[PDB]
């Protein structure tokens, strides 16, 4: 336990015995604010919905074995698996996951276990009000749930009693982190795309309130008209109501402006407000906060000038999109995180690729490639190809 | 608990499924409602913050 590394920080940073938030308050309201975003809650959603479109299972683990939960209780661990809790389905777990994954870069959840140590029931835990306590080795101890007068106290995956097979025999909770920099990971050092998307944001929702400003505020007449002294009290009346008579359904509409003897000047007022919106600068934040998500801009619906210089078709940037950031920036953390604090050596938890409706077309044209090779078993070619082992 | 349907004069009152008396297969014998909820940042599991 001395041998870890960690106890060079926790010891400065987190002393022991003291409870502290896992998150600054300024991430908290950053995020709060992006889900009311015309621009950040489209790439929060759309990352949400392509992460919970992929199902997962219960499986063996292919490179350890031995020692494994039988087929009954993977089956029993899968009705967990698909019915988290009496309120949230998989899909929803799945959401508020890769939602808490993409704000603030980590994520957390509860497990209810019974005596015999197998799963019932799982809930999510929301970011913002969770607060670990550390021991001296820099290992967590506690999750600490909850406001001050009404704490939820829950004891880690590590201090909880386990069964002769390592297993836990009581209620208890875990955290998955994102690596940073400087090493520790379990120290307040967090790493998130809302890290790096103030400025654009800020400019954004300034050029944003100045459009609104403007359109709020700016005079709509169409041309401004000026007049001498030299007109009597009643004449100056005339000529307006000649003016007027001129609207459409007017008893004059469409004829031509006839004045005698003055020198009514005539001035015409062009507002343009074409450009209202500042249209480029307003495009390029988009743009900058889409890329900073990793979401192609052409998924997002938003406009680009150049979509065919680059991408041939629509297909391709869908499949580039998943193939690219939802494998390995989401699933493959769920995934290794659930197999590490669920399932037992010898078993894992994983992900349905290659069943997503994205991959469907190559997925087939490229296994009637192989169907040409003879060089290579068929084993050989249902491994390459995602299919089992007869 | 309980889902209430109606203003303040002609309300109705709807047990929940959870609350509905329910027979030996554990599904319900009396009328009931029930609600899906699309989650959240905070976590919270069926509060009043929407997601539209």
Redesign the interface.
Same mark, same amino acid.
Request: net charge neutral.
């Given at each position: 336990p001395s041998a870890n590394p960690a106890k060079i920080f926790i010891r400065r940073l987190f002393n022991s015995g003291i409870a502290k938030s896992v998150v600054s308050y300024s991430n908290v309201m950053a @995020?709060?604010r992006a889900?009311e975003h015309p621009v950040v809650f489209r790439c929060l959603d759309k990352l949400g919905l392509t992460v919970q479109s992929v199902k997962w299972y219960v499986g063996a683990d292919p490179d350890i074995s031995g020692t494994g939960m039988s087929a009954k209780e993977r089956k029993a661990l899968q009705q967990v698996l698909n019915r988290p809790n009496?309120?949230?389905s998989g899909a929803?777990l799945r959401? @508020?996951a890769t939602?808490?994954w993409a704000?603030f870069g980590r994520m957390a959840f509860k497990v209810s276990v019974m005596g015999d140590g197998s799963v019932n029931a799982i809930?999510?835990?929301?970011?913002?009000?969770l607060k670990q306590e550390f021991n001296k080795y820099g290992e967590v101890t506690t999750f600490q749930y909850g406001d001050e007068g009404n704490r939820e106290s829950i004891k880690s995956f590590y201090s909880a009693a386990k069964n002769e097979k390592g297993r836990p025999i009581e209620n208890y909770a875990f955290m998955i982190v994102k690596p940073s920099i400087n090493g520790a990971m379990n120290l307040d050092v967090q790493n998130t795309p809302l890290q790096a998307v103030g400025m654009p944001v800020a400019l954004y929702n300034g050029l944003m309130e100045r459009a609104l400003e403007q359109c709020d505020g700016t005079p709509n007449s169409k041309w401004f008209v000026t007049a001498g002294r030299d007109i009597g009290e009643v004449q100056s009346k005339e000529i307006k109501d000649g003016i007027d008579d001129t609207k459409p359904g007017g008893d004059s509409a469409g004829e031509i402006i006839f004045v005698f003897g003055e020198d009514v000047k005539l001035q015409e007022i062009k507002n343009d407000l074409s450009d209202i919106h500042s249209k480029i600068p307003l495009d390029d934040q988009a743009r900058t906060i889409a890329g900073n998500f990793g979401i192609p801009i052409a998924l997002l619906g938003f406009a680009a000038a150049d979509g065919s210089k680059f991408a041939s078709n629509y297909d391709e940037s869908r499949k580039a999109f998943f193939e690219d950031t939802i494998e390995p920036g989401y699933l493959t953390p769920m995934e290794d995180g659930f197999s590490m604090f669920l399932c037992a050596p010898g078993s894992r938890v994983i992900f349905d690729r290659d069943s997503i409706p994205a991959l469907k077309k190559s997925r087939a044209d490229i296994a009637a490639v192989y169907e040409k090779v003879t060089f290579i078993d068929e084993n050989e070619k249902r491994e390459v190809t995602g299919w089992p082992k007869k």
């Open positions: @995020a709060a889900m009496s309120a949230m929803q959401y @508020a939602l808490s704000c809930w999510p835990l929301g970011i913002p009000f």
